[PDB]
Amino acid sequence: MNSVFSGLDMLILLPYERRGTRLVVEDYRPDHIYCIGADFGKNQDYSVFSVLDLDTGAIACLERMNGATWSDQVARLKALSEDYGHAYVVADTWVGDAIAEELDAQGINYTPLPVKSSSVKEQLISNLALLMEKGQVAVPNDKTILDELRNFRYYRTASGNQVMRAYGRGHDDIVMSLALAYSQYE
């Protein structure tokens, strides 16, 4: 089969509380270090921010939004960063340059991961899936997160390019957000 996350058996599911748009697994612990994997979506696609607690290896918080302005999205990203001790952002902007200019303007500390190459995407995703297989990924036990992971698939094109995307016309911005966060997991 062409399911990307074959180690879904090993995905750990954590309880959470919905506090607005945030699913919260843990509040900020000052002795821990955090980072945010931020995927940005245009149109129907969602922007998703995932807070990884690097000291624990688990997602502390996840925030999802759809169809807000860039200024709105970045300002929610900022506030998320401040509430997790000025956590560094890994951002996927591959959305135009408008998002980048908003990130710079509001003064966010972030690495733009190109995500403009089949190869780079493969590495992010492969890394997430292998960490999952090893039992080192833990996410809020939420139907929406689990479904995107369950439905993420490999496809082949006529040129032999690999496509990694949701089954059908589903969304995969949660997969990418998670992949960006766990890119910092050691």
Numbering used by the authors: 256 to 349, 351 to 442
Task: Quote what the paper states about this structure.
The large terminase protein is a key component of the DNA packaging machinery in tailed bacteriophages and evolutionarily related herpes viruses. Typically, in addition to an ATPase domain which powers DNA translocation, the large terminase contains a nuclease domain which cuts concatemeric DNA, generated by rolling circle replication. Crystal structures of the large terminase nuclease from the thermophilic bacteriophage G20c show that it is most similar to the RuvC family of the RNase H-like endonucleases. The overall structure adopts the RNase-H fold.
Subsequently a recombinant protein construct, residues 257 to 443, corresponding to the nuclease domain, crystallized in two different crystal forms, 2 and 3. Crystal forms 1 and 2 contain a single molecule, whereas crystal form 3 contains two protein molecules per asymmetric unit. The two other loops, L0 and L3, residues 295–301 and 423–427, respectively, also contribute to the active site. Superposition of crystal forms 1, 2 and 3 shows that four loops (L0, L1, L2, L3) surrounding the catalytic site and the β-hairpin are flexible and adopt different conformations. We note that D347, implicated in facilitating metal binding at site B during the catalysis (see below), is located at the N-terminus of L1. The position of this residue differs significantly between crystal forms 2 and 3, bringing the carboxyl group of D347 1.4 Å closer to the catalytic D294, which is expected to coordinate to both site A and B metals.
